[PDB]
Design a protein around this ligand. Sequence first.
Ligand SMILES: [Ca+2]
Length: 339
Amino acid sequence: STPKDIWGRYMAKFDLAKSHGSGIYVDLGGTERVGATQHRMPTGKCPVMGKVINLGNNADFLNRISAENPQDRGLAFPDTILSPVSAADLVRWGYDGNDVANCAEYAGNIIPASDTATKYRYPFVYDAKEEMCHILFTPMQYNRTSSLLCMEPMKSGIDAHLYYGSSRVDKKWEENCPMYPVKDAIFGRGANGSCVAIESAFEEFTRDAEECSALMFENAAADLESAKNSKGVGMNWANYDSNTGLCRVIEETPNCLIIDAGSFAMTAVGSPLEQDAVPFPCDIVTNGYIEPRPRSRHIFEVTTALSREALKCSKYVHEKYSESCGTYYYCSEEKPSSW
Ligand SMILES: [Ca+2]
């Protein structure tokens, strides 16, 4: 069938407006009355790996907001115990999903004292390394050593094992959300029976996938500077070429992939680490253009494919190794050195 068609099942997760549906960088996509007041809160459906909040006082954001020393205060629930709780605790208490899902459901069952009927819920951060579930005392994420109240989100490689989310996290987050870089992949959209690489919103050389991930994250869907809501729209995806270090951040929704060894197709919600990648899906076969075609006022367009029959080529066919699928084919102007 068409590229859009044969990719449709695999690529649904990458449509972050649908699978997540709220801001990623800053998620304040919901509002709820608590008494007389409206308050904004996160409502995104995917957990966001590696999202930490950097604080003005330089305290780790998972410290209690009620630490004795003001220099120590984070964003975590005070001890006056709701929080943090262990993954095992949550299973003790009857929760039946994975740990990240349990943590989200647990955040969903903690109701603000000031009003016992509010639909208002706090965010969580699940630490997969310590297996501990933290409830945050505030949905604040971005605000201009200062105070704790001076803050911004960042995507952190070494905290890749942290998951920031809202109580609306999909129980099936792991299958429905793009949580992993796709190895040997470039994001594209279907055009004229091929998968064509999506043009960069902007590009920069970065030192590793994590840096590329952090660059894109800063520009991802953000529910502030009601009408301040992103609906999940933003520069949410990036192609990291591990051979060149070129990070291409994109803002169009991908709906297919092009195979290309050494390239990593990353998203603002998913792991920042190459280590966490998932192999290219060898079973889904289409012809791809590796290079974009942006608007330009000024040669040969390399195509790739997992099979010789699928590859559209008007010159020489070569073979290249990929970790994901072993050998695949590309169309080049050079004659094979086998010849
Ligand atoms: Ca149960």
